[model samples]
Target: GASIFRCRQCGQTISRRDWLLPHEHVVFNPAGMIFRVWCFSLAQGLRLIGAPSGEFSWFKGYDWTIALCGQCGSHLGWHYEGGSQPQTFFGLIKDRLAEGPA
Candidate 1:
């Protein structure tokens, strides 16, 4: 199922895909595009996961593998990166965030 996005503007829960670049505008670059995970509250960019080129770095973490909905094609969050890569710090969204190292 497409992950639901609570649109602050309309106060409607829409698919993440619908919120960002709707499914109609989805462009499949042979290189692929990063999933747009909205910040907690506002619809703002948080972190960019996945290597469109599939060429990744060991130091930056999250080389690939972000979770996406298979049905309506909604984006929920990400599959945090580990290892020597930079720690994947989410929270670009300021919606429900209480407090953090941001």
Candidate 2:
């Protein structure tokens, strides 16, 4: 399938180009396990779901909070706090998002 980004739960454009990160990497849990995560400098059309998570090292000393689709409440990624940007990054799971443009 052609690359595209949309809310998995609802078909909404995941577009906000200026926010994409420079690259992608395997994300890890607090216990030190690697998964997949793509970093974005900023994003829009998503909202914080709940309280900020305690902490995680994958994003350089930032607390993570759940972020969801504003329209469908689907788990999009995380909202990082305590860094340069008010929300430093949007750590979206690779699988959660469909293949996107390079």
Candidate 3:
């Protein structure tokens, strides 16, 4: 029994339940845009774009870049790097991904 997370726009598989990090769900507000984020250690279906920026980062010491759906190029979330613990992670918008059984 496994769950898959997919891009809401294109329905491409993004991450799985097993890839979820501990304390996977977090809420963040960057510039007052509140987002409920789901953290995952792996999100293979994401296409990362732009230079990583540390400004207004939700996680300290981590720079982030835009994350999009690999197939359709829809905005999915962000890819984070340079964290001391995890090194890398995906902070996906909860509303942007749909869940289904795998």
Candidate 4:
């Protein structure tokens, strides 16, 4: 297994399951404090400051933007309008979720 991420509030390693559930509160925005967000999910990691941004920028074709944790300044995830991908078993997305300048 890889190094896991523990939440500062709950002291438990965050899983995709943690991103769900009815009682979870996540701060979802990089908001200029972090990376180019080359398309990673919120639960993934905070996009570094070198990450991309904007309406007509590298993220143009994509449907959503990445979010960051306002509390710990960690990368949380990418956000679109839907929940879950198109299929199960194939739903485990560990890849980056954004695009940036060349």
Candidate 5:
């Protein structure tokens, strides 16, 4: 059965989607160490930073910010944007969120 997703620290509902974004994965090439992320088209109860990390060399236009839960200040994922496309993304750590179906 499917389960609802929520914030582990604040019990805030994240989303009802069963699967994560198609572009989700752990990467070791770009970063100095292995990094993990889950892509999502959209999510709620998240607060994104006004400025993204300036360390980005590849996607210089896009900024990467730590995704935190608005309610509990928990690290959930990364908020990214920069490409020509006007789409924004939330790349959350899959394990950081409490999952089940809503």
Candidate 6:
């Protein structure tokens, strides 16, 4: 069975469970701010904003851009792209996402 996840502020589909990257769900404390993030291969419901930057990046060698909900423009998390290769992924805030009915 596939589980769907939605934005907490708006009922917009974010990503499915199957889209999650293996062993990518983890906790991180960046500059004393703790956040739980789930990495996903694809998050089509999100809108990325701003230029990608490496400063304060949680993942080493990956530049990050702010990610927002497409429907309500709610801050969800970030979209990451590797610096040395053609790699991309989404690191969505766990608290900002809620499991939804399939």
Q: Which candidate wins on lDDT?
A: 3
lDDT tens string, model 2, 8-69? 66766664445567867886676775657777776666778778765555666688888787
Worst 10 residues of 2 by lDDT: 11-20
lDDT, residue 73, candidate 1 = 35
Q: Write the per-residue lDDT of candidate 4 for residues 6-34, one digit (tens) a residue.
A: 44443333344323323222222346433
Which pairs clash in model 2?
27-35
Candidate 5 lDDT score at position 58: 33
**lDDT (Cα, tens digit) per residue for candidate 5, span 1-102:** 356679877788775465456755875535475557677767888888668774742334666777788888888877877655635667777677777655
When 2 and 6 are scored with lDDT, the better candidate is 6
> What is the per-residue lDDT of model 6 for residues 27-80, given as tens digits with 9 covering 90 to 100?
555557767788888887888999999987877799999999999999889999
Give the Å error, residue 12, model 2.
Answer: 1.7
Clash count per candidate:
7, 1, 0, 19, 6, 0
TM-score, cand. 3 vs. native: 0.89
Q: How well is each residue in 1-41 modelled by candidate 1, as lDDT tens digits?
A: 43455433333332343333311112222467543234222
Give stretches of model 6 more than 4 Å off.
Answer: 24-31, 84-86
Q: Kindly indicate the candidate among 1 and 3 with the higher TM-score.
A: 3
Q: lDDT winner between 2 and 4, please give it.
A: 2
> Whole-model Cα lDDT per candidate?
0.33, 0.69, 0.86, 0.34, 0.70, 0.84
- Model 2 quality (TM-score): 0.70
Give the number of the best model, judged by TM-score.
Answer: 3
Q: After superposition, how far is residue 23 of candidate 4 from its true place, in Å?
A: 30
lDDT of 5 at 102: 57
